Design an enzyme around this catalytic site. Structure first.
Site, PDB file in Angstrom:
ATOM      1  CB  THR A   1      38.382  10.267  35.014  1.00 31.41           C
ATOM      2  OG1 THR A   1      37.935  10.872  33.789  1.00 31.41           O
ATOM      3  CG2 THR A   1      37.771  11.016  36.175  1.00 31.41           C
TER       4      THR A   1
HETATM    5  C1  LIG Z   1      34.136   6.002  46.490  1.00 33.69           C
HETATM    6  C2  LIG Z   1      34.984   5.474  45.372  1.00 33.69           C
HETATM    7  N1  LIG Z   1      36.123   4.953  45.440  1.00 33.69           N
HETATM    8  C3  LIG Z   1      36.644   4.565  44.172  1.00 33.69           C
HETATM    9  C4  LIG Z   1      37.983   3.915  43.951  1.00 33.69           C
HETATM   10  C5  LIG Z   1      35.613   4.951  43.407  1.00 33.69           C
HETATM   11  C6  LIG Z   1      35.495   4.837  41.934  1.00 33.69           C
HETATM   12  O1  LIG Z   1      36.503   4.615  41.287  1.00 33.69           O
HETATM   13  N2  LIG Z   1      34.251   4.978  41.406  1.00 33.69           N
HETATM   14  C7  LIG Z   1      33.800   4.914  40.046  1.00 33.69           C
HETATM   15  C8  LIG Z   1      32.433   4.728  39.813  1.00 33.69           C
HETATM   16  C9  LIG Z   1      31.913   4.671  38.520  1.00 33.69           C
HETATM   17  C10 LIG Z   1      32.765   4.796  37.427  1.00 33.69           C
HETATM   18  F1  LIG Z   1      32.276   4.734  36.194  1.00 33.69           F
HETATM   19  C11 LIG Z   1      34.127   4.982  37.636  1.00 33.69           C
HETATM   20  C12 LIG Z   1      35.065   5.120  36.464  1.00 33.69           C
HETATM   21  N3  LIG Z   1      36.045   6.135  36.243  1.00 33.69           N
HETATM   22  C13 LIG Z   1      36.618   5.898  35.159  1.00 33.69           C
HETATM   23  N4  LIG Z   1      37.673   6.658  34.553  1.00 33.69           N
HETATM   24  C14 LIG Z   1      38.176   6.274  33.454  1.00 33.69           C
HETATM   25  C15 LIG Z   1      37.626   5.045  32.832  1.00 33.69           C
HETATM   26  C16 LIG Z   1      38.219   4.607  31.504  1.00 33.69           C
HETATM   27  N5  LIG Z   1      38.668   5.644  30.770  1.00 33.69           N
HETATM   28  C17 LIG Z   1      39.237   5.506  29.562  1.00 33.69           C
HETATM   29  C18 LIG Z   1      39.394   4.237  29.013  1.00 33.69           C
HETATM   30  C19 LIG Z   1      38.952   3.136  29.743  1.00 33.69           C
HETATM   31  C20 LIG Z   1      38.360   3.293  31.000  1.00 33.69           C
HETATM   32  C21 LIG Z   1      37.919   1.995  31.697  1.00 33.69           C
HETATM   33  C22 LIG Z   1      36.618   4.402  33.449  1.00 33.69           C
HETATM   34  N6  LIG Z   1      36.156   4.832  34.591  1.00 33.69           N
HETATM   35  N7  LIG Z   1      35.188   4.372  35.435  1.00 33.69           N
HETATM   36  C23 LIG Z   1      34.638   5.047  38.933  1.00 33.69           C
HETATM   37  O2  LIG Z   1      34.586   5.508  44.091  1.00 33.69           O
HETATM   38  B1  LIG Z   2      37.628  10.129  32.603  1.00 29.86           B
HETATM   39  O1  LIG Z   2      38.898   9.554  31.953  1.00 29.86           O
HETATM   40  O2  LIG Z   2      36.721   8.928  32.843  1.00 29.86           O
HETATM   41  C1  LIG Z   2      36.817  10.960  31.484  1.00 29.86           C
HETATM   42  C2  LIG Z   2      35.404  11.148  32.024  1.00 29.86           C
HETATM   43  C3  LIG Z   2      34.912  12.587  31.991  1.00 29.86           C
HETATM   44  C4  LIG Z   2      35.078  13.255  30.636  1.00 29.86           C
HETATM   45  C5  LIG Z   2      33.445  12.606  32.370  1.00 29.86           C
HETATM   46  N1  LIG Z   2      36.682  10.384  30.141  1.00 29.86           N
HETATM   47  C6  LIG Z   2      36.878   9.130  29.747  1.00 29.86           C
HETATM   48  O3  LIG Z   2      37.942   8.565  29.930  1.00 29.86           O
HETATM   49  C7  LIG Z   2      35.742   8.424  29.068  1.00 29.86           C
HETATM   50  C8  LIG Z   2      36.034   6.939  29.171  1.00 29.86           C
HETATM   51  C9  LIG Z   2      34.834   6.044  28.996  1.00 29.86           C
HETATM   52  C10 LIG Z   2      34.224   5.501  30.118  1.00 29.86           C
HETATM   53  C11 LIG Z   2      33.124   4.666  29.968  1.00 29.86           C
HETATM   54  C12 LIG Z   2      32.646   4.373  28.696  1.00 29.86           C
HETATM   55  C13 LIG Z   2      33.265   4.912  27.574  1.00 29.86           C
HETATM   56  C14 LIG Z   2      34.363   5.748  27.725  1.00 29.86           C
HETATM   57  N2  LIG Z   2      35.671   8.807  27.679  1.00 29.86           N
HETATM   58  C15 LIG Z   2      34.547   9.235  27.118  1.00 29.86           C
HETATM   59  O4  LIG Z   2      33.459   9.072  27.639  1.00 29.86           O
HETATM   60  C16 LIG Z   2      34.630   9.924  25.793  1.00 29.86           C
HETATM   61  C17 LIG Z   2      34.843   9.184  24.637  1.00 29.86           C
HETATM   62  N3  LIG Z   2      34.915   9.813  23.460  1.00 29.86           N
HETATM   63  C18 LIG Z   2      34.787  11.143  23.387  1.00 29.86           C
HETATM   64  C19 LIG Z   2      34.577  11.891  24.541  1.00 29.86           C
HETATM   65  N4  LIG Z   2      34.506  11.267  25.720  1.00 29.86           N
END
Ligand SMILES: Cc1nc(C)c(C(=O)Nc2ccc(F)c(-c3nc4ncc(-c5ncccc5C)cn4n3)c2)o1
Ligand SMILES: *[B]([O])([O])[C]([C][C]([C])[C])[N]C(=O)[C]([C]C1=[C][C]=[C][C]=[C]1)[N]C(=O)C1=[C]N=[C][C]=N1
Lengths: 230, 235, 218, 206, 229, 214, 204, 201, 238
Positions: free
Chosen positions: H1
């Site tokens: 994301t």
């Molecule tokens: C004002 C501001 N400045 C920044 C730079 C941000 C920010 O980054 N805030 C934020 C807050 C809560 C979240 F939860 C997240 C967030 N987004 C994600 N996208 C993808 C995955 C993920 N996906 C797939 C596999 C593994 C992972 C770890 C995990 N997260 N966690 C990001 O806010």
């Molecule tokens: B983005 O990449 O964070 C996106 C968020 C959006 C769909 C709301 N999806 C994901 O990558 C998340 C990653 C994740 C973050 C924290 C805990 C677990 C996973 N994936 C999912 O939530 C997910 C997993 N399986 C099926 C559907 N969605």
């Protein structure tokens, strides 16, 4: 006046009228009879059907409480089903906690305390019901009657209902010591067809039930062909 | 008066406080509802106490959702808490089912609240009296335009043309004629404003009544303006 | 106190179910003379592999449910498919309360032609088959029960379904540690459930490769 | 702790300064976020911490001072009564369900006589606080990583009789030391002051 | 469960239910007490309904702790709720301060039990008054609660039937420097002049709180006093 | 003791223009044994037009199928007999998976049904209810075998060739047999026999198919 | 540990017709000085003076509940609280919260105004009552104070010469403890007067 | 994301990817990471997929119930404060959501940001997600307040793309919205692979 | 009459008037006729005729489960509180046992639901009657509850306003109900229902609700469209 409006009001002479008014609901109800026959207890009642289209088996006033005991009610039918569903709960407790069948004198003393507890509080009214506990436990054949006041008493025979005074004299001619359960179903049913008149109701039938050694100490209803015809 | 109770039956089979709440509907402003295959019109007199009242403050028509309107009669202080309950129920349906709540199920969600009254609380805190308001719920769904009435008895009934309030007995005689089942919506406009002219005591002006419709092909609630209500009068 | 493996199979006309009469405590075999086959009502029977205290409280509960529904009302007795359903929903309720009924069970029942054979776990898994085995009979005895149901798809008679249970109970005595050679067989038919007197199987320990000089590590 | 709060009181004013940095574990979200909440017209608090509990603690304190002015006909309470109400909310939260507030704050204020019968405090007030519920009235208080750099700086240079300009060039030395030694990039410091005429936002020192 | 109040105001402005309870609290037997410079005497009158009612079993002088005593005149079973709540509230004081309770603070606590039932829902007021007396760190005390909750600090008083003509006899016989033995001499003497028959050791019951302790007098120590007056 | 346990199996569905094909193999297995080969408890019918097809833990599967069963019945009683659509059921599924978020089900769900327009749409869910409408979906232990396979032959991507015409019920069914005969070869927790459900507007027809027994 | 988070040592000695009580002036967060002019003593009347040590959040919260309960005791009972009643009162307060316990260690010193008997009491954090006739001490430098107080005490001391022993015992123990120091504030108290003295100490 | 959004002279532009990966496996590629709350608000999605889609559906219910009771639109200062009070109440329950709300109330634009821990900040420039650190360096180089409508749509579509190209947890179909005074319009919807042969032909 | 105000007050003749007053609510509701056959139970309710064009609809007949259904008379606001209880306790049965609930158990469960509301002071009886139409392993059942707490097992019955005349018609044909087919069993129910109507009205599809439960037939309510096959050809002959 206001001295007969609830249960928590003694009279000027120490009487409770709402209990005694509930005793007039049993005295205006259908006729009940019972007998203790030195190896078991036989109980018979008269079902006053108010319509020709009632199914045979409707409004059965005899209910099985345990395997060895069962309460027949005399008075209001829906008020007595709260007594039956309570004494079943008292008999399920002794099987599940104390691993023993409930005794006949102990099941009746639990009925007389449930019926008495609704004659001491203002928010509750007494039952319009006299419960007849017929049991065969390890203390022998037992026959008890709980009145709406909560008074229990062991009997040899009992008449309850409207014509409970004429049917009481018909029980004094039986024996209860040489009396068996084989002959008493024909005798007690013949009390009801002589004590009750057909000039008020057209539909009346009898419902007999026993518990004795011939039925393997089990409280059962009759096979339909043991009752006299009329 | 406290010689009776709140749950005391009559010897004729009626409950005292429910029968005494139906009479409180006849001492209120009148209201209308006309089911037509293009939509449902909800006309209602406003019955202002004085000319010093701004008329946009005592709206006899309240929205439940975009597709359900509700017009009341009787005391309107009890009318708010039923509509404030129907709005919560009809949004929990969109939260759970991703679809608009049917018009029937919004009437059922109101009638469940209009029966919860007693005198002994115990486990739950109950209401002390029945609601002195008869609602009249209209809307469109998959079955099209539907009209419903909640009475203080708790009795919901689907209708085609129903009038509640003070001018309700005279309107049912007008309902017998002057209504066929395949009218147009604009013919349902001029039917309601002619009934609401007859059954009221004051002079019918555009700032005197309230008219709102829920169209079938639109699917949305369309309340009117005083410049729109006047165009129905001059037909 | 813990029970051992329980095996069961359908035949043409009814269901058989066998179990050893042993109740071990860890490795110690405390009591070789307790019956594990409880029968339910008038048409069904259950037996468990696992904790005996959990089974003794669970079967006390579901026996009280059969009689009191039948005694109080003018209704028929529960079928085996409906009292197994109460047995399944009562075990799943206990694991959601974080206090499960830690045992596998085997349930049999025959009501007027319709034979019923199913098992249930402590978690809440349930399955229906023509051959149920729990414990280490699911590893040992259950492969032998599966080939004899597919070598004749018309069905097993009672005589040939009793030969293969005895062939399966014999290998359970060979290869399970917490087992004895004393078995009871329930027999649910159209007449009802009938538990037999405890018997034993004929074991062969006389192979010429089992002698002292061959198996020696000199 | 990544962001510092510096406050010192003098004869007729209280300086405060709080770096307006907001970050996400290494990423600078802002550089100008006001972290010195104006509670009353003569009272303010410079909270440090992450932005979650910091707003929700200050809004609970600020709306209850305003409520206590509604119910008491606009009578402004003292600075010690506000400070003792604050540490009641810190101390009752470390033994609760939701957990402790992770906020470190410096309360500041000026005491004015509300009537002719008031013979209380006339001077300035400055209170050190903590996330646990410690309360201490102190000549100068500091939080953050750069607190120990500047608390020993104020051991050297602070005087009780500093003027408005002499304490203004002292706070400039306080802000330039945090830019010199702390690895955390604090570039804009939001200097405010509490005097007898209310609060004032100093534009010069940043 | 009848949570409405039973005691309300009258159009004259008087709690007429508590006025009835003070009539009920004045139909008991004559209980009294006097003070002194060295102690406080309380005196009761055990009226036996028959000769078969075990006069050594019934009691009217109630000891509450190692320093407090009490004697009632009114409804007997209503008093036992007050004594059991006063014996309980006096043990809760010792588990919290490691000190005997003062006679002031115990009487404030039992006066909050009278007033509790005159403003509760579904109960009637008490129909009995008390005579609490004992020691504390600032001398000797003799209090007297009422069914309204109004408590006093008397110096010599009497409650029950024959009380207004026995309280007037206490005015004529009290002296400001009465000793303790002089107090028992006149507390038994003011029982006799309203008493019907001839008072014996099983017929009255006294208790004189001395120097730290209440100590209900026994049948031998009270027999010493009857043949002296 | 652990209150979670994976019971194998897989479910796959491919939705067409006025139909959905829904499949799931009949194989129950536990710790290291094989409990059954004939469990029909993997695909559940909610309404005549919408099914649920879940797998994972068999014990929490049967509990989720019943709570879904009666929320449809309270929908049918409170709406005058109106049967809920696929979109209404699949949002009901997406909420109830989040109401139990802290002690969740060990199920992985698919709500499979037809639209109000008649087109078939399959949804998929994680353990906590992340929904999305999509034209196919594959859950279970053999999901990583089949979900890349359905990407390569339904989407028609990375192939410089013109588009084939729309898939019939028969060409979809013969395609979906090639996945379960492919998952029975390479996945040890999958395959005794797969049961195909064909949901059309004129009722549902039901077929079976044989896989490898090992 | 949580008990040695804030720093500070409070002790008390018993004399002939007098007693002393003395705390340090340091407040801290495990190594760093927050304040240098903060005592730990509290005075409720002209006979009882008590000192709290431990966690400073609990040193202020518990002392608010004591002042809530001491002033409510004076409204109900028309009298000042005594030493045996005050020490048995906040013994009960530390036992009600036995599983959520306060991190204070109160050091109570009291005297009878009319009799002249001193009463010392030092409970634990869970409310363990203990009345020595010689001295009590709590805080971070408590292990250093049992050596200083026991080697220098005698039962028959004048108020002027009991101050000289308690002051040299606090300072010599705070020169070995790195969480206590920065001068000391003492309070000698007899039947006739209360004298409060601030003592020179090392600013280290 | 890699959701981002920025505020400029002319409104607010929201730009997302469409990829949901449960670790090293890609679950889906057509995820709508903008839940439109109503016809003048937007909400974005990052972190847990179910935690965002639940509580922004709860947020869309509290905004609809505002208009029913009070008869007027909800502001964005009230809309995020609903979402921030919900989020701070469940801060110890292990939620994972990072959401921006963007809308046109009666006080112009406002672009907020809510954590999973109860934070709420007010800026004109954000980029959230795991690959957001790639989307800052290309956006902070080219951002200015007085951009045109077409150039700020180009800067948003190009700043998503350089983070989808570099982060493994980002990609798919870049969706660009524009929040003007009459509401929001979906500007474009295009694949990331098609967008590579436009920016580097 | 000072013994009729409270529910917990017996008369000096031994009568409960608040229970006898709730029985008049059932005798004032719309007339409904239940007729039990050999494998089928037919309920025939008389809903309200339109006022010369406008058709008011009010639901009386309720489905409880696949094998149970009931028709109410009296206070319809208490007939839906019973419908909440009966539908919930049939879902809790089929959850546990995976089969339909027997009718002799269910008729004993309604009677204890009426009984909790007739003995406490701040409660009132359900002023509504029922007609259970059930089928189970023991065959078809037809019950009827009254606000007293009774439950009667019938062969045929009729409750409602002026339902005494419908009961008089059923007391001549109730011996010939185990022999008729389904098409004749609907006809005996509609001829019975037509004798409770007004002086100048007869039956059609606009004022009649026909509900049938059977052995291979779940509880089906025949309304406007599908009810025409039994109601277009119908005449109340003398
Ligand atoms: C004002 C501001 N400045 C920044 C730079 C941000 C920010 O980054 N805030 C934020 C807050 C809560 C979240 F939860 C997240 C967030 N987004 C994600 N996208 C993808 C995955 C993920 N996906 C797939 C596999 C593994 C992972 C770890 C995990 N997260 N966690 C990001 O806010
Ligand atoms: B983005 O990449 O964070 C996106 C968020 C959006 C769909 C709301 N999806 C994901 O990558 C998340 C990653 C994740 C973050 C924290 C805990 C677990 C996973 N994936 C999912 O939530 C997910 C997993 N399986 C099926 C559907 N969605």
């Amino acid at each position: 006046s206001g001295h007969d409006q609830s249960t928590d009001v003694f009279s000027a002479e120490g009487r409770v009228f709402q209990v005694e008014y509930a005793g007039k609901a049993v005295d205006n109800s259908s006729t009940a009879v019972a007998a203790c026959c030195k190896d078991g207890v036989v109980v018979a009642v008269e079902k006053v059907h108010t319509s020709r289209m009632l199914e045979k088996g409707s409004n059965n006033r005899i209910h099985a409480v345990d395997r060895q005991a069962g309460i027949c009610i005399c008075g209001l039918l829906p008020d007595g089903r709260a007594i039956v569903s309570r004494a079943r709960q008292e008999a399920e407790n002794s099987r599940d906690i104390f691993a023993t069948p409930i005794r006949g004198s102990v099941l009746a003393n639990r009925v007389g305390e449930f019926m008495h507890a609704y004659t001491t509080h203002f928010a509750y009214r007494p039952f319009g019901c006299s419960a007849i506990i017929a049991s065969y436990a390890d203390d022998g054949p037992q026959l008890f009657v709980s009145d709406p006041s909560g008074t229990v008493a062991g009997y040899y025979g009992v008449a309850l209902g409207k014509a409970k005074t004429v049917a009481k004299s018909e029980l004094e001619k039986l024996d209860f010591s040489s009396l068996t359960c084989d002959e008493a179903v024909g005798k007690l049913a013949s009390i009801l067809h002589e004590v009750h008149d057909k000039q008020k109701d057209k539909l009346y039938e009898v419902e007999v039930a026993w518990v004795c050694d011939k039925s393997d100490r089990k409280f059962v209803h009759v096979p339909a062909d043991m009752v006299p015809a009329e | 008066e406290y010689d009776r109770g709140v749950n005391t039956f009559s010897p004729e089979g009626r409950i005292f406080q429910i029968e005494y709440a139906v009479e409180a509907i006849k001492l209120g402003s009148t209201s209308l509802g006309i089911r037509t295959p293009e939509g449902v019109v909800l006309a209602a007199e406003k019955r202002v106490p004085s000319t010093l009242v701004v008329p946009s403050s005592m709206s006899k028509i309240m929205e439940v959702d975009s597709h359900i309107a509700a017009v009341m009669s009787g005391m309107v202080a009890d009318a708010r808490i039923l509509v404030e309950h129907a709005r919560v129920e009809s949004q929990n349906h969109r939260f759970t089912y991703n679809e608009p709540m049917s018009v029937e199920s919004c009437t059922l969600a109101t009638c469940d609240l209009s029966i919860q009254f007693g005198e002994s609380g115990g486990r739950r805190k109950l209401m002390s009296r029945p609601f002195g308001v008869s609602l009249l719920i209209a809307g469109v769904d998959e079955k099209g335009p539907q009209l419903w009435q909640t009475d203080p008895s708790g009795t919901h009934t689907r209708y085609d043309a129903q009038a509640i309030g003070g001018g309700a007995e005279a309107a049912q005689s007008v309902f017998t004629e002057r209504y066929h089942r395949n009218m147009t919506l604009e013919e349902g406009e001029t039917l309601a404003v002619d009934i609401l002219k007859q059954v009221m005591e004051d002079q019918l002006s555009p700032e005197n009544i309230e008219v709102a419709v829920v169209r079938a092909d639109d699917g949305k609630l369309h309340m009117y303006t005083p410049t729109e209500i006047k165009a129905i009068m001059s037909r | 106190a813990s029970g051992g493996s329980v095996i069961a199979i359908k035949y043409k006309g009814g269901v058989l179910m066998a179990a050893d009469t042993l109740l071990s405590y860890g490795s110690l075999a405390k009591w070789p003379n307790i019956p594990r086959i409880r029968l339910l009502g008038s048409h069904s029977a259950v037996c468990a592999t696992g904790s005996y205290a959990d089974f003794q409280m669970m079967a006390k509960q579901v026996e009280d449910n059969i009689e009191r529904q039948k005694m109080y009302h003018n209704v028929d007795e529960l079928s085996p498919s409906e009292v197994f359903s109460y047995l399944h929903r009562s075990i799943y309720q206990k694991r959601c309360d974080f206090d499960p009924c830690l045992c596998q069970m085997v349930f049999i029942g025959v009501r007027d032609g319709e034979t019923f054979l199913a098992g249930v776990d402590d978690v809440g898994t349930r399955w229906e088959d023509d051959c149920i085995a729990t414990g280490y009979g699911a590893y040992i005895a259950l492969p032998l029960l599966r080939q004899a149901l597919e070598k004749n798809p018309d069905g097993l008679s009672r005589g040939e379904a009793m030969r293969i249970l005895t062939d399966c109970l014999r290998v359970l005595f060979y290869r399970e540690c917490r087992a004895i050679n004393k078995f009871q067989v329930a027999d649910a038919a159209s007449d009802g459930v009938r538990i037999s007197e405890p018997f034993d199987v004929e074991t062969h320990w006389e192979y010429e490769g089992y002698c002292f000089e061959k198996t020696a590590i000199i | 702790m990544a962001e510092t709060a510096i406050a010192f009181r003098c004869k007729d004013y209280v300086m405060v300064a709080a770096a307006g940095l907001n970050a996400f574990y290494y990423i600078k979200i802002t550089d100008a976020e006001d972290k010195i909440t104006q509670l009353d017209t003569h009272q303010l608090v410079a909270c440090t911490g992450e932005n979650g509990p910091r707003v929700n603690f200050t809004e609970y304190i600020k709306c209850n001072l305003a409520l206590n002015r509604m119910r008491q006909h606009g009578r402004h309470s003292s600075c010690e009564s506000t400070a003792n109400f604050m540490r009641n909310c810190l101390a009752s939260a470390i033994r609760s369900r939701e957990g402790a507030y992770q906020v470190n704050c410096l309360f500041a204020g000026y005491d004015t006589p509300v009537s002719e019968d008031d013979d209380g405090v006339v001077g300035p007030q400055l209170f050190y606080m903590d996330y646990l519920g410690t309360l201490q009235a102190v000549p100068y208080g500091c939080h953050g990583y750069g607190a120990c750099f500047v608390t020993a700086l104020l051991d050297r240079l602070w005087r009780p009789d500093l003027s408005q300009q002499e304490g203004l060039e002292l706070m400039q030395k306080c802000c330039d030391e945090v830019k010199r030694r702390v690895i955390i990039s604090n570039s804009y410091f939001f200097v405010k002051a509490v005097t007898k005429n209310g609060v004032e936002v100093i534009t010069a020192v940043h | 469960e009848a949570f409405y109040g039973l005691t309300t105001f009258s159009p004259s402005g008087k709690l007429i239910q508590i006025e009835y309870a003070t009539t009920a609290a004045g139909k008991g037997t004559t209980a009294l007490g006097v003070k002194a410079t060295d102690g406080v005497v309380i005196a009761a009158k055990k009226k036996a309904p028959s000769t078969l009612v075990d006069a050594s079993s019934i009691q009217k002088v109630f000891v509450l702790d190692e320093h407090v005593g009490c004697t009632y005149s009114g409804m007997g079973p209503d008093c036992r709720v007050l004594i059991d709540s006063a014996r309980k509230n006096c043990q809760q004081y010792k588990l919290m301060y490691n000190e005997p309770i003062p006679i002031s603070q115990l009487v404030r606590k039992i006066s909050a039990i009278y007033q509790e039932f005159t403003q509760s829902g579904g109960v009637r007021p008490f129909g009995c008054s008390l005579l609490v007396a004992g020691v504390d760190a600032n001398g000797y005390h003799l209090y007297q609660v009422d069914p309204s909750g109004t408590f006093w600090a008397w110096k010599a008083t009497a409650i029950g039937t024959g009380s207004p003509d026995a309280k007037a006899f206490l005015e004529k016989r009290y002296t400001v420097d009465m000793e303790l033995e002089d107090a028992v001499h006149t507390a038994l003497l003011t029982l006799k002049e309203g008493f019907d028959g001839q008072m014996t050791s099983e017929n009255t019951q006294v208790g004189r709180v001395v120097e730290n302790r209440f100590e209900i007098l026994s049948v031998d120590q009270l027999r010493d006093y009857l043949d002296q007056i | 003791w652990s209150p979670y346990q994976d019971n194998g199996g897989t479910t796959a569905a491919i939705a067409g223009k006025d139909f959905v094909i829904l499949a799931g193999d009949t194989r129950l297995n536990g710790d290291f044994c094989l409990h059954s080969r004939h469990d029909q408890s993997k695909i559940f019918q909610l309404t005549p037009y919408t099914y649920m097809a879940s797998n994972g833990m068999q014990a929490d599967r049967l509990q989720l199928q019943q709570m879904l069963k009666y929320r449809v019945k309270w929908y049918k009683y409170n709406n005058g007999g109106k049967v809920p659509s696929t979109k209404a059921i699949a949002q009901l599924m997406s909420t109830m998976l989040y109401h139990r978020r802290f002690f969740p089900y060990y199920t992985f769900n698919m709500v499979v049904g037809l639209d109000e327009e008649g087109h078939g749409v399959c949804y998929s869910y994680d353990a906590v209810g992340s929904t999305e409408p999509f034209l196919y979906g594959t859950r279970g232990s053999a999901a990583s075998f089949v979900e890349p396979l359905l990407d390569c032959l339904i989407n028609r991507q990375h192939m410089t060739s013109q588009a084939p015409p729309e898939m019939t019920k028969e060409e979809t069914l013969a395609m979906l047999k090639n996945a379960f005969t492919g998952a029975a070869e390479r996945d040890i927790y999958t395959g005794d026999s797969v049961s195909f459900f064909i949901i059309t507007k004129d009722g549902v027809q039901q077929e079976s198919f044989e896989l490898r027994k090992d | 540990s949580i008990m040695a988070y804030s720093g500070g040592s409070v002790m008390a000695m018993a004399g002939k017709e007098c007693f002393v009580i003395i705390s340090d002036n340091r407040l801290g967060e495990q190594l760093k000085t927050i304040s240098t002019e903060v005592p730990k003593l509290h005075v409720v009347n002209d006979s009882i003076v008590y000192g709290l040590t431990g966690l400073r959040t609990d040193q202020q919260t518990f002392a608010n509940k004591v002042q809530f309960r001491t002033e409510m005791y004076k409204l109900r009972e028309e009298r000042d609280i005594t030493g045996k009643a005050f020490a048995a009162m906040i013994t009960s307060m530390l036992y009600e919260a036995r599983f959520g316990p306060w991190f204070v260690e109160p050091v109570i010193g009291s005297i009878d105004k009319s009799t002249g008997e001193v009463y010392l009491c030092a409970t634990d954090l869970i409310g363990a009552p203990c009345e020595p006739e010689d001295y009590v001490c709590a805080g971070t430098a408590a292990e250093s104070l049992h050596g200083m107080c026991e080697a220098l005490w005698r039962p028959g001391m004048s108020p002027e010469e009991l101050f000289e022993i308690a002051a040299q015992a606090m300072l010599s123990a705070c020169d070995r403890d790195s969480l206590s120091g920065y001068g000391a504030v003492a309070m000698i108290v007899t039947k006739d007067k209360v004298t409060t003295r601030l003592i020179k100490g090392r600013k280290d | 994301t890699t959701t981002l959004a920025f505020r400029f002279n002319g409104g607010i532009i929201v730009a997302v990817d469409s990829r949901a990966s449960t670790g090293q496996y890609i679950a889906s590629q057509t995820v709508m990471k903008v839940l439109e709350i109503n016809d003048y608000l937007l909400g974005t999605l990052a972190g847990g997929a179910a935690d965002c889609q639940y509580w922004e559906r709860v947020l869309g219910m509290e905004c609809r119930l505002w208009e029913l009771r009070n008869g007027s639109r909800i502001t964005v200062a009230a809309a995020s404060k609903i979402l921030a009070n919900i989020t701070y109440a469940y801060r110890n329950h292990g939620l994972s959501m990072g959401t921006m709300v963007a809308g046109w109330d009666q006080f112009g634009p406002s672009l907020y940001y809510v954590d999973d821990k109860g934070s709420r900040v007010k800026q004109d420039l954000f980029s959230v997600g795991s690959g957001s650190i790639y989307a800052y360096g290309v956006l902070d180089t080219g951002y200015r307040k007085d951009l045109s409508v077409e150039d700020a749509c180009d800067l948003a579509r190009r700043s998503i793309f350089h983070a989808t190209y570099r982060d493994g947890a980002s990609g798919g179909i870049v969706t660009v919205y524009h929040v003007h005074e009459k509401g929001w319009t979906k500007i474009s919807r295009d694949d990331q692979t098609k967008l590579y042969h436009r920016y580097f032909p | 009459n000072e013994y009729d105000s409270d529910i917990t007050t017996w008369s000096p003749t031994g009568r409960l008037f608040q229970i006898e007053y709730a029985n008049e609510a059932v005798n004032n509701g719309s007339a409904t006729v239940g007729v039990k056959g050999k494998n089928f139970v037919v309920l025939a309710a008389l809903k309200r005729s339109p006022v010369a064009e406008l058709s008011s609809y009010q639901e009386k007949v309720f489905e409880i489960d696949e094998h149970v259904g009931m028709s109410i008379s009296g206070l319809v606001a208490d007939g839906r509180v019973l419908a909440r209880y009966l539908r919930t306790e049939c879902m809790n049965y089929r959850y546990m046992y995976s089969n339909g609930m027997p009718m002799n158990q269910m008729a004993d469960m309604i009677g204890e639901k009426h009984q909790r509301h007739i003995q406490c002071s701040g409660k009132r009886p359900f002023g509504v009657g029922l007609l259970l139409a059930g089928y189970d392993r023991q065959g078809p059942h037809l019950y009827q509850t009254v606000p007293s707490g009774d439950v009667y097992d019938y062969k045929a019955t009729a409750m409602g306003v002026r339902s005494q005349a419908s009961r008089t018609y059923l007391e001549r044909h109730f011996e010939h109900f185990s022999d008729c087919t389904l098409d004749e069993l609907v006809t005996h129910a509609l001829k019975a229902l037509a004798s409770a109507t007004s002086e100048g009205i007869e039956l059609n599809v606009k004022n009649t609700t026909i509900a049938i439960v059977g052995k291979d037939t779940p509880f089906t309510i025949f309304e406007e469209e599908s009810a025409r096959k039994y109601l277009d050809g119908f005449k109340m002959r003398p």
